Design a protein around this nucleic acid. Sequence first.
DNA 1: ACGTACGCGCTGTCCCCCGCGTTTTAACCGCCAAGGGGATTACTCCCTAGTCTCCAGGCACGTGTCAGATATATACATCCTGT
DNA 2: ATCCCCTTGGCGGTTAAAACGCGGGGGACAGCGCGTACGTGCGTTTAAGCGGTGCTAGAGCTGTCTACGACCAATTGAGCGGC
Lengths: 95, 95, 95, 97, 97, 109, 109, 83, 83, 83
Amino acid sequence: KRSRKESYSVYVYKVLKQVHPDTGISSKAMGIMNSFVNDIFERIAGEASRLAHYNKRSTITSREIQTAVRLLLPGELAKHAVSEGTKAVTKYTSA
Amino acid sequence: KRSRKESYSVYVYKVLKQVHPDTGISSKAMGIMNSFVNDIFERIAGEASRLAHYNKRSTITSREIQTAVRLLLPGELAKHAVSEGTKAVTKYTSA
Amino acid sequence: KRSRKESYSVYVYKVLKQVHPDTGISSKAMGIMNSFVNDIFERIAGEASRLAHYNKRSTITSREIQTAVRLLLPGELAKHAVSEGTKAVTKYTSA
Amino acid sequence: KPHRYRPGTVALREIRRYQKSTELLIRKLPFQRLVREIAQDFKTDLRFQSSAVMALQEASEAYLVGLFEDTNLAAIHAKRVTIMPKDIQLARRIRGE
Amino acid sequence: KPHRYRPGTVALREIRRYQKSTELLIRKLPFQRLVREIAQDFKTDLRFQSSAVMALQEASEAYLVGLFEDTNLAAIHAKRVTIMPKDIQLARRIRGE
Amino acid sequence: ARAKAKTRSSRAGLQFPVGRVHRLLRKGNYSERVGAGAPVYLAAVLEYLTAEILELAGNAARDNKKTRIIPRHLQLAIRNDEELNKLLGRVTIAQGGVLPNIQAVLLPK
Amino acid sequence: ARAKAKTRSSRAGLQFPVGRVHRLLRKGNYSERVGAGAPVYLAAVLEYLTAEILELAGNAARDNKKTRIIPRHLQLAIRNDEELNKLLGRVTIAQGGVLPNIQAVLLPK
Amino acid sequence: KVLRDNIQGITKPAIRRLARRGGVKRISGLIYEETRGVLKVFLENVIRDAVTYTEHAKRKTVTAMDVVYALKRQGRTLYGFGG
Amino acid sequence: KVLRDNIQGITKPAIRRLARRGGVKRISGLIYEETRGVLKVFLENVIRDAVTYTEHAKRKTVTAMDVVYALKRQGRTLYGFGG
Amino acid sequence: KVLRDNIQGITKPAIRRLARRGGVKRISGLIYEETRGVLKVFLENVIRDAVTYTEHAKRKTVTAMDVVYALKRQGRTLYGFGG
DNA sequence: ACGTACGCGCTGTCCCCCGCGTTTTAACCGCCAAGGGGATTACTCCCTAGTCTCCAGGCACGTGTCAGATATATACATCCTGT
DNA sequence: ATCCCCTTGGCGGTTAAAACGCGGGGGACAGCGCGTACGTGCGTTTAAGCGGTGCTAGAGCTGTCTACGACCAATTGAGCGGC
């Protein structure tokens, strides 16, 4: 008997095949991507919590992360991310 | 009232509100965009018809337009176009 | 009137008179001390959160914060703080 | 002959006096104008607390003090009493920019 | 006579060979012995997972190679190519430890 | 008891119509039958091209410190881009003029 | 009697899980309320990040003509970009080594 | 209305006093321009964070509260104005 | 069971190879022992923190998760072992 | 199986004979390189198009019919191979 | 163990910067109008957490298979050597 | 929706802020060797690497239970506002 350990397996595999169908994966690289997504997630999450404390809002909306991604993410990366999330949330509200 | 002269009006304004919320649109620039969409749609539709006759196909699906985008649009734009078109058809299959 | 805006003025003044009855205090120094209280408190609270989630603990106890003190506070300052907190919690449990 | 001090002695007197000094070392109003200048480079018609001008003033001067104490460490490592811009550049590189 | 390269180009060959390589340059067994020894210096009879020893090995690997690239920056600051330990003391000080 | 009329463009997550593009493919007389991926794919490539060229148009307008897009900005935006130029070599923009492309020897020394 | 299941990722057209990130923000204990657009926004941000870095890593793997991505490819991918360098200056990569960085004075002549 | 140079208002003698605090005893002329440059870089980062706070605060006047918040995020935490 | 001299377990050629990865051409003789010392104090911090994590867990074996976690709270996060 | 550099298989006197059909009296030695380069460019375009045609048709052998289709697309319509 | 190479001590040598010193000018000081926005308060709506139920994608497991791990023979790069 | 207050806007006097020129005078730095010290080329050895074997410590999961602590209405009191 084994307990399942959660990871970011199929999502990184699918996004790689969406960007490069003919490029393979090694498992140590897969661990590096697991640690990357966990690290950046906790960075944004902690910054969002600090903003919620800071403006005394009891909530984290899309606007808090919008603020947080010009906080941590730089510039063109941040503005492309803002655009991606903006179109994502418009598709989400349309669905 | 008069008969409706169909155009791409509201679509060009909403895609601009996605990509640049603050800038405005002139009627001349909007006519340029209408004639651009007319030209590119005409080119891709005509080449799709060409591939329909050429492979003796009565059917034109996304695969022939992927063929046509690989034909007409050069390189960087071609693979970019294939990427968001593939994302679009996957979300179409997932409705 | 105004809403009561909270600060650590009185208690630092209390410990000030406790350890130096003859000395005075300034407003700038008191703002520095309030920022110091806030800074050290938030560092220990953040490390206590990390210890809570790394062990999947839903609570932060004296063991959790005690460990966090050994992490944050270095060396003899750490063990003196352990001694003070242990004496304090034994006095607290003695009611 | 009018009396004149040797170079560095007035400099070291300034060192001792202004490590002894605790006040703000920059003129207030041009710093306020500069932070407003950078503000309208970002958002239009934006306003500041005077306390915020104080806060950026004291943070800016202390941050610069950090860069320059790193600059002395680099310069004495470079065996120079006259610093150069490459000292500050290397300090920015090592500090984790 | 057997062929002999000049002092330095074998070192640069080792350089180029090792940024094209990825392999962990520290021997496994004495590193595991060292981590058990340092841990035993604090708390007794302490066991290490092999994954922990390996993970700490690339950790220490990256920490020191960051320190050496930083001291190479300190050396080209000092007009030198051979680093000396005051570069490391400088790097420790201006990094803030 | 019919389902709510929800749009195929939002099914694509896109803005250029599946409906209008499919209609002009059917009534443009290009094939007897048209697959469902065809109008969504072609609307997607038009939206990509449109977003890219209005990105360059907006940057061109803000470079000229102006707010509203003009065909001067459009023509400038087209012939800064090599693959757009290769796409639109034989097309002339109304009121766009010519981007400054001055050959060197006719410039003064 | 019941609506058919659609994931929020398919509603947003993302393939990172919206529900997983929403859970992990609930149980990451960052606020007692979280706006609904926040986790899908964050998942889209990580989607852009992972897509960017997998473009870079796949391109690097083609450049060293290897079919499978390796942490060496990842470490070249991060370290050959400036804004990812600022994003991950303090990050250790297992078996990624160091970027090829020789100083100009270390070269002979 | 707009202003085009107040970077020089943090003057050459003012930069001289600032380096006198750091213990710097001789300063060549090339340092000062790069010091105002990195002053612009740091304060640009801080005010970017600050206006991002401020726009997120849905206000139009910057307080010192978001200033010390941004100094906390950048890693140069300031004592004296917290709370 | 007791170990005495594992500072010399990290051999001199291992140190030279380390500095090869960091791009050091020439390595003087005084470097090896004090780099052993700074590796020692780095592991004193990291292992003290990680072992403190373990004894917080009431575990007896040090895990790689605690090594990377004690790394990460020192601003030295590592990728590749469950972080 | 794999080839590297067969582009000189279109020999220089072949290019000379081509220019004699093109009515060039004197062909510089510099000329042959960009003729090979533009021939590479044109064939790269044509074979890209033709490969796209054949891969659309789910085949593995290029027909001359697809070649003359590629010449229809790019604007160099050729007569005499079943177009 | 041979040996080239690096760290550098000192010292001229141009050379740039500190310091004194008067002048000029704009912040400092101190002084009034005011209003816009910071900040506070009532409302009612937006929004999201949370349970029951149900399903469906995502991870453990196995495996089997071809990209890669390993092996062997030339070509050139390089790096010293020789005229 | 408001209110009221600290910033914004404008005004007058001054002297330090600065600022620029003169002049002294302190400084970086190439470089020419010299001291020397690792760098590199080998041989030697030995212990790490590799492969195989037996033990069991404790990691981790499961069940039990109970130790522990937010909530809430309420009472009150000690610190916040204000002078």
